[PDB]
Paper text:
In contrast to hNSun6, which could only methylate four tRNAs with U73, PhNSun6 could catalyze m5C72 formation on eleven PhtRNAs harboring either U73 or G73. PhNSun6, with 12 α-helices and 19 β-strands, is divided into two distinct domains with different sizes: the MTase domain, including an RRM motif (residues 34–79 and residues 173–185) and a Rossmann-fold catalytic core (residues 185–389), and the PUA domain (residues 86–164). The tRNA substrates recognized by PhNSun6 were based on (i) the 3′ CCA terminus, (ii) the target site C72, (iii) U73 or G73, and (iv) the discriminatory base pair C2:G71 at the acceptor stem.
To fully decipher the RNA recognition mechanism of PhNSun6, we obtained the crystal structures of PhNSun6 with and without its cofactors, including apo-PhNSun6, and PhNSun6 complexed with SAM, SFG and SAH, which diffracted to 2.6, 2.5, 2.5 and 2.2 Å, respectively. The PUA domain is inserted into the MTase domain via two linkers: Residues 79–86 and residues 164–173. A non-conserved extension motif (residues 1–34) was observed at the N-terminus. Although PhNSun6 contains a different RNA recognition motif compared with that in hNSun6, the main structure of PhNSun6 adopts a similar topology to hNSun6 and the two active Cys residues of PhNSun6 are conserved. Some structural differences were observed between PhNSun6 and hNSun6. Third, PhNSun6 lacks the eukaryotic specific Lys-rich loop. Taken together, the structural differences between PhNSun6 and hNSun6 might contribute to the distinct tRNA substrate recognition mechanisms.
Numbering used by the authors: 5 to 388
The structure:
Amino acid sequence: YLEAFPKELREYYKNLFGKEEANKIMKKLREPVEHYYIRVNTLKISREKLIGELKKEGLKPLRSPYLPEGLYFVREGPNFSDDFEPKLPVVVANKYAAESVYQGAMLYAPGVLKADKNIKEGDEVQIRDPKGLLVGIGIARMDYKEMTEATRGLAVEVTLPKFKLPSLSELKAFEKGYFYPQGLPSMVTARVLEPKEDDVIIDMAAAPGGKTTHIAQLLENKGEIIAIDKSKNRLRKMEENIKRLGVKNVKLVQMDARKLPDLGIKADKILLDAPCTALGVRPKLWEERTLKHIEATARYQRAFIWAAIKSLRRGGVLVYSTCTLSYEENEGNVKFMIRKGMKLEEQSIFIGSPGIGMNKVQRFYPHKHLTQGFFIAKLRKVKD
């Protein structure tokens, strides 16, 4: 599994966590989340009512003892060994389609990069990503020709994916806005912010609106949430999400959030889900980003951070989060905040790990907490 991570990044991980831990993390990083979490949209439905609806579709949702709005599904797999060499003709899927097949999705024609020319409909085939990673096994629903020519349609019925997560996008319960797929550490982030109806609240990296709509339902559609993102297209999707979830709490604004104080607004609560190297996202088939990206991105984040701090009222609260594992983007950029009049506060919910040489921040590790790599920092602005 180590091959999914560039050499210098592996050393970085060995240096930051210790060889043994780093090897457990990278191993789990290649696999999907063991517990797949969704958020109960309490604006429309209670948790137990939703559970009833999900069980109707043959789904087995489990309750979270920590998050009353939390449900999760248990991941199936692996369904074959890491060294399994199926005696099958090969279908090569592109990068993105291979990742979804890896988690149980069918393989559709536009996801087909190339294939063995002996494949006819009904043939058992193995699916590999462009680098040879075995991600699934199934039955061809197209001949070779149609498979490499169609623009739509089922190409390979995946009957044995490497891993299985429930597909929830196609459910009535989703279309009715009863839930929103969201990770446990992401949900913790929104709780730890502790939004109040009176609070002036800014989500400066809001799209696609996961945490934004979370805050919404926590406020019970009261008050106002300002939600910012770079492109309107990302906001277009978010408007759809907001509509579906029956959220009436959010004001969308399109802008470079690094220029946030250009608004005449001093906020009480600010959530910065900062753009990051995403080193912690799962599943991680091949890690493309590396050390040069960590440094550059860590520097890139500081402009958001500094913008946030200047837009905060005295005694205001900032929640800083990333889905990355690096020190520079996390503990390092919090030390930057501490030098700029921000104080570390205890978080209302702490079920993860402590930080690296750092006490009140919260981390999530895939091997320990069955989640994505995640970082949560809650700060209080004591002075300018």
